[PDB]
Amino acid sequence: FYFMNQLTYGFLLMITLLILFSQFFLPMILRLYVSRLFISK
């Protein structure tokens, strides 16, 4: 039932995904899209 390095570390890492990606990556993909929109008008 040893889950210290399998559950806690993975859980913290997935917080890192949920926070860092939604702060940086999908926002700058949408920034690419909206910049293309802006130059296209």
Distance linking the first and last C-alpha atoms of the chain: 59
Q: What is the CA angle 21-39-36, rounded to 5?
A: 30
Site string for another protein, 1-40 (x = CB under 8 A): xxx-xxxxxxx-xxxxxxxxxxxxxxxxxxxxxxxxxxxx
Q: How far is the CB of 29 from another protein (least distance, A)?
A: 5
3-state secondary structure of 1: coil
Residues that bind another protein in the complex, under the rule CB under 8 A: 1-3, 5-11, 13-41
